[PDB]
């Protein structure tokens, strides 16, 4: 079966740059992590080093003006969006950006597990004014990283996104944070990630290398680009362990 | 075998963007909805989610200035025109647009059946000046959706459309709704859809993937463009149930 | 034998749009009419619906300015010109245009049979000042439709057309009518339809689908275009009963 | 077999519009006319109708400004030059143009035979100043058609054409007629036609489909263009009687 | 052998127009002439009619300004130059141009035989001031035609041509004559015809159809064009009697 | 067999100029040098001469304005980065430029081994503000060459590079040296090299002809260009000893 | 078989106009001339006539402004340089130009043999300032032709050419002659011809059709163009005696 | 084996003009010289005549401004650089240029043998200020020719070249000399000839026809051109004795 796969495939099928490749987490490239927050728990690891790669290429993909927010999305469920988003967030934090990860998936949120946080209040309650700005965002044990978790599952998630309420939040967010990452649901599945892109204008696209359909990843791209926002590039996730390239190797007196 | 079957066939045969695909209804993808007004019955079903997609990229398809009104048409009857019109209207309303749906099908209307409303007074009688504006538009149970039903079957539907009464009514509607969707008869069959199209300059074209003749389809396309209107794009209907297909996952 | 035929043929041979197709009148698409004035006598019929198609596409073929007059013509005798012209006239009437059909065929006039009217006075007597403006035009039992029949057969029909007399009439006609249809003789046969086109500038071309020669229809086109007037498109007439397309079908609770 | 046979062959061999086709006379298409001046004898015959066509699209072939004068010529004798000249003149007159036909064939004139007029005085004697203008042009039975006959065969026809007397006469004619048609000798044979052409800048070129050599034909074409004149187009003559062919129906 | 031949050959090899074709003088196309001055002695003949053809096409080859002088020349001896030149001169005369034929062949002059005149004084003696302007030009029995014959054979003919003396004569000639024809020697053989062209700027080129070499006729052309003067076209001479074309036929009640 | 082997393979695979080739060291081409700092040990050896070449045409590769600082990097470890950095620094100093070499490899530094210097204080501790500028840069035995060693292995090398302390330090360095060369870790492995590159806008890219994968090589190329930096060109390393090859004659 | 044989071969091999062809002398085409100065001995011979051709179209080859001076050269010795130079000079004089011919061949001069003049004083001694201008140029029997002979063979011919004395002399010559032709040594062999060419900017290039190597010939061509000079064109020499060939008729 | 060879090869491989070809010195084309200073010792010889060829083509390769200095260089040792340079220098002298040959090869200098001169002081000592301007340049027995020999072998030759000291010398040199030839070491071997080119801007390139590698001569060219200086052309040296061409022949009464 014909999927994408590796950096050449991306080039050929999507005509976009690969910002970085993660490597399906084994015990070598993560220095055995328990949680999937590799950048926090094993910061000198090759996979962590790839995240830093992505961080950089994001700032590089756009000179003249610093990019202060992204949507992370993909064509389909379980591609790694949530995982990419969190590690990337941590990377941003480590470099002294005041960093907000936002859980804009108000349908199957995972940020609150990843960072292991209560989800009584969050984006949804925030936008409905069920909860307050100070109470809804939490500061984590990771310096310079806050999380705005999804909040209760609303009945009308996409409509919450297209509201002055969100427009207003988003404006408030870019005043108070140097970098904003919005985790979203898959773009083929619900329109959510489109509407988030309309605000950010920059999208990072996660393609699950182990499992995808060439044409859907194609329609995801076209759905993002339809909003007019810039697709900064791709992160290939769940890449096979090579790891003869180096690229994947560990570098530092061991 | 001459059918436009999928979004490739649209690209290739008509050169148009596909705004969304609606699959053939089933209990799963409608999430057990009991009518065809699925965006209202089962707001969180995949079929509904796809209507939000259409909603979304209708809006993107014309950046700088909003799209205020569309026509919904198709090359033939039974393609889903009325059903897509009604659902799309519900989706818009949920997005918080003051929406009107107009049954511009004064020959075989169905909006009164969709929204289970009376149809004594409506578009025709409004136009013939035999009923008032406020008497003719009804507010539904659905927040922010009004319906201007077709009214009685007039003897001259299309001549009513190009009358000065509809032009006045149309300006009036644009003062009073953020979004106006006009259901129509098929465009190959009678002009009506064309006339409406001239007023909206914006058309969503429904193609019933399950049963269509590709030549008749591009013919509806040329009949629309002739009006000067913009074809925002195609909606595919009755698509075959790929559901394999992360386009149609229940999430979650 | 190689004739035109159907919409594709028109496209290929003439490089012009088809404004509409009539269907050879049977009992189904006309709801049995006696007279050939289908738009008057069976207004909710598919053939009548096609005429309305044509009406529309005529107004569409020319934005910036409304088209207030046409010549209807064809390559050859018995193509349907006269029949198209009358039904179209009626369609225009039904839509509240004040509509004059003019019988500019002063050699084999048929309008006076179609509408069943006396032909003692008409265009020819009008132009010669044998008859008066008020007496020469008749109002029919069809609201908003008048007919100016041909008048007596003159000896010099084409010369009557190229006269200040006609220029003057034509000017008077566009003051008093919202829409003017001029029926003419075949353009391959006599120059008449050219000279009428020089005034109107818009020509509707009737091709008899059952019976024509590809090349003559071609020379008709070139003869019209030689006058500088716009050929708005084609009406294919006498089309075979398909009627699996729909396009030809009846639409409305029966 | 090297003949230019039909309007395709014109297009292809000469790149010119065909202003009309005249078929080989017969009782039907002349409607039993008793002379060759058919536009006058049998005004309503198909052959005549075709002359009205030529008339018409002579006029269209040069929009913005009228065409006031033409030359009629051909590559060879017996092609129909004189006959088309005379009929075309009648057609113009019926259209109500004050027309003059000039027999510029001072070698083998035939306009005096066509219009059965005397030929004592005429173009030559006018030019040599041996007869007056008013004495030389005659008014025919036909309303609005004058004929300036060739006059006696002079010893130097072409040198008369480029004389200052013809230039003066020519300006004079243009003051006095809405339309002036000059019949000429064939253009391959002697210059005369060329000289006239320089004065009219407008030429109708007759090609006798029944008998012609295609190379000699394009050669007449280059001989004309050399003058700077416009070739308004071709008239085909002696065409073979398609009559099947709604071009040549009697209507009616 | 490959020579030129007919009008098509000229087109192909020289890319120039044919101004006219003479026909090798027989008894039919000349109405039996004794002398080779056909235009004078049999003026209504087909060959004479061809000369008139040439006359016309010369005036036609150059609008904006009338062409008041030509050089007649060719690639090679006995092509007909002298014969063309004289008849053409006569044609010009007959049309009321005051016409000077000049015998610029001061090496094998023939004009004085053609017109049968004394050659004691002429161009050569004129330029050397051996003879006077009034005595050196003769008026012939042909109205409006004068001849300036060659004069005695000088030792330095080409140098006489490139002199202020000639420049001066030439200027005087264009004041007193409406048309000037200069007969010259063959352009491949001596430079004479080049230098005459530098004054006239218009050259008529005579190709002997019976006898020539394709490539030399080519070099003649290039030699003329090198002076910058306009080659108005070609006269094909000594053409075969066809005379089925007509073109060659006689036209006028016989 | 997928290696970039020679300057043809550079041209073809990467489209870049080759600034110089360094062959695999031997007693002849190093002229019996006892360390790898050959430009200093054996200033007149061919290998050294080739470093002067690189020096030279670094400078030509950017005419109008001098190149003040470069990054040295490569797609993989063991390619010669550190060695070319150090020698190139010596060459520059001999040319009389006040040169600084910065060990920007805060993971596996080797500049302290090359120049046999202590590495207690250096880039890291400077950046963390735990040691002073004058304490951190050392002046070597070599006239006009200072070395800013890596300092202790910090826990966060790349985050130190994009800190405001390095930006300040970097401006400071440019005030104080005519030429600054930054050794780095391989560019495929960790970002560091990219970050430095953004500051210099000038990169010399080392390709180890003896052992490399051509795809990984162009990948380092794209990783560099992404920064906006100029790739001045390639240095080939460990080239195979053509010495036949007047490129590598001992002259004399 | 690698020879440039005819004017086709010139066109094709060198892209140049042929100003004239000189055939191999014989009693007929020289008309029994007793020396090689044929334009003077036998002014009316075909060979002479052809020199008038060259004369003529030298002048045409540069319209707007006269050509005042040329160099005559060739790729090899024995090609006819001196002979064409001398005759061309005579032709010019007969045309009434105050002509000077300069023997710029101070190695193997022959102008003194052609014009049978003494050669004690001349170009060299003039340049070295060992003889005066008026002493060095001689007036020949031939009206309007002076000859500046080569003078004694100097030890440094080319260094004399680029001296400031020749520049002064050259300006002086241009004040004093309407036309100056410089004979030279072959251009492949020694620079002299090049130097002269820089002063005239005008070159006539002689190619000896009877014996030449086509590569050496285009090489003389590039050697000339290098100077910036105009190559007015080729003279072909020793052509084979077509005489069949109206180019070479005796007329008459 | 594939080397260059002859003038066509240069054209094909280098896309540059050949300024001249020397001929491997035998007893014929040198009139037997002992020393390799042919232009001095056998000035009327064919090889000497070729040098004069080069001289000229150098002045020709660059109009608008006279070229007052060159670097002579080549791809590789023993190509003839030094020999070309000296003879060329002499040629320049003979034409009354005040001519300095500079020995910029401070690694294997040969100028001092060629001209047979002491090498205690020269360029190297000059630049280090070990020696004076007046003492370091010597006037030879050849009128108008001075030599600045290399001086002692310095430890850092290339650095001496890139110094204000050299910049200053070079400036002083172009004030006092009409023409400056700098002999250099091979450009593939040491960077020296590049740095000399940066000052002169014009380079003459010597290719040893008997012995070279096509590709290295190619890299030499690219190395010169990298400095931005003009490569004026090539001198092919050590060319085979043909000498049927002529080009190589002797011209002058023998
Ligand atoms: Mg997710
Ligand atoms: Mg419906
Ligand atoms: Mg009719
Ligand atoms: Mg006639
Ligand atoms: Mg002659
Ligand atoms: Mg390293
Ligand atoms: Mg000589
Ligand atoms: Mg050397």
The domain count of chain A comes to: 1
Order of helices and strands of chain A: HEHHEHEHHHEEHHEHEHE
Task: Please name the fourth-level CATH homologous superfamily of chain A.
Answer: P-loop containing nucleotide triphosphate hydrolases
CATH topology of chain A, which one?
A: Rossmann fold
Q: Which outline of chain A best applies?
A: globular
How many whole angstroms does the radius of gyration of chain A measure? 17 Å
Number of strands of chain A: 8
| CATH class placement of chain A | Alpha Beta
Write the layout of secondary structure elements.
Eight copies of one chain form a homooctamer.
Chain A: H1 7-14, E1 18-23, H2 38-41, H3 46-60, E2 69-73, H4 81-94, E3 99-103, H5 111-114, H6 123-127, H7 133-136, E4 138-139, E5 145-148, H8 157-161, H9 164-176, E6 179-183, H10 192-200, E7 202-208, H11 214-225, E8 230-239
Parallel strand pairs in A: 1-8, 2-6, 2-7, 3-5, 3-6, 7-8
Antiparallel strand pairs in A: 4-5
Helix pairs in contact in A: 3-4
The complex binds magnesium ion (8 copies).
One magnesium ion binds next to helix 4 of chain F.
Question: What is shown here, in short?
Answer:
8 copies of one chain form a homooctamer. Chain A is an alpha/beta fold and 254 residues long.
Description:
Eight copies of one chain form a homooctamer. Chain A has 254 residues and is of the alpha/beta class. Chain A has one domain (1-254): Rossmann fold (3-Layer(aba) Sandwich). Chain A is 37% helix and 17% strand. An eight-stranded mixed beta sheet of chain A has the order 1-8-7-2-6-3-5-4, sandwiched between helices. In chain A, helix 3 crosses helix 4. The termini of chain A are far apart. Chains in contact: A-B, A-F, B-C, C-D, D-E, E-G, F-H, G-H. The interface between A and F is medium-sized, with 23 and 27 residues. One magnesium ion (MG) binds next to helix 4 of chain H. Chains A, C, E, H: It comes from Staphylococcus aureus. Chains A, C, E, H: One of its GO terms (cellular component) is plasma membrane. Chains A, C, E, H: This is non-specific protein-tyrosine kinase.
């Amino acid at each position: 079966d014909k999927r994408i796969k590796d950096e050449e495939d991306v080039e050929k099928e999507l005509g976009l740059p690969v910002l970085g490749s993660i490597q399906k987490f084994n015990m070598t490239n993560t220095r055995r992590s328990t949680s999937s927050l590799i950048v926090h728990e094993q910061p000198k690891s090759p996979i962590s080093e790839k995240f830093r790669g992505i961080r950089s290429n994001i700032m590089f993909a756009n000179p003249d003006s610093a990019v202060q927010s992204i949507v992370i999305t993909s064509e389909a469920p379980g591609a790694g969006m949530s995982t990419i988003a969190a590690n990337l967030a941590v990377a941003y934090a480590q470099a002294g950006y005041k960093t907000l990860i936002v859980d804009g998936d108000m349908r199957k949120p995972t940020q609150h597990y990843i960072f292991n946080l209560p989800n009584n209040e969050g984006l949804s309650s925030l936008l409905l004014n069920w909860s307050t700005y100070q109470d809804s965002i939490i500061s984590t044990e990771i310096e310079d990283l806050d999380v705005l978790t999804s909040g209760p599952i609303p009945p009308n998630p996409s409509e919450l996104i297209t509201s002055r309420a969100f427009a207003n939040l988003y404006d408030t967010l870019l005043m108070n944070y140097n970098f904003v990452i919005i985790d979203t649901p898959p773009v083929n599945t619900v329109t959510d990630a489109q509407l988030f892109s309309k605000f950010t204008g920059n999208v990072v696209y996660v393609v699950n290398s182990e499992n995808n359909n060439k044409d859907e990843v194609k329609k995801g791209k076209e759905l993002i680009e339809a909003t007019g926002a810039k697709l900064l590039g791709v992160v290939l996730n769940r890449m096979p362990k090579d790891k003869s390239a180096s690229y994947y190797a560990y570098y530092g007196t061991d």
